[PDB]
Design a protein around this ligand. Structure first.
Ligand SMILES: [Zn+2]
Ligand SMILES: [Zn+2]
Ligand SMILES: [Zn+2]
Ligand SMILES: [Zn+2]
Lengths: 70, 72
DNA sequence: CCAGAACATGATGTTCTG
DNA sequence: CCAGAACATCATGTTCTG
């Protein structure tokens, strides 16, 4: 039921992992994109339904640690 | 000189009482009028510079107020 | 049911206007 | 020179399509 990356309502098993739709397409664009994402914090941001917008670097990192893969 | 007191980018002039760049100018005005409720994902002390200022509206808004920005 | 594209919408930053 | 609106361009998220 819950996205393992942002804890929003999950939609299905995506890229190996139970995630929401927004996290699905974020992760695909991160991996297949340039993107030199820079954290404004300490590389340990909270990733929420809301706070996931704030830090792509941490969102992407949390995706990987969740086992998201192509 | 001159530098934005909010994000350290080049200031374009004195806006809402403070030396700021144009982007911080419109950001502030947008924030003090808008919805908004912003949430920090870090520890309420994010680095706000030209690079990172898009990351944390909450901290950028905070720096705007600390610098003394206001509508009058 | 899922990947990937598309189509809205959001958030931002520069330019134009008063 | 500055405020506010308008325009353009993102990043993000939902819906359509394979
Ligand atoms: Zn998610
Ligand atoms: Zn971060
Ligand atoms: Zn600024
Ligand atoms: Zn912050």
């Amino acid at each position: 039921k819950l996205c393992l990356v942002c804890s929003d309502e999950a939609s299905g098993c995506h890229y190996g992992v139970l995630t929401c739709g927004s996290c699905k397409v974020f992760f695909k664009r991160a991996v297949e994109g340039q993107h030199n994402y820079l954290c404004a914090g300490r590389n340990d941001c909270i990733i929420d339904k809301i706070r996931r917008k704030n830090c792509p670097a941490c969102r992407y990192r949390k995706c990987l640690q969740a086992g998201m893969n192509l």
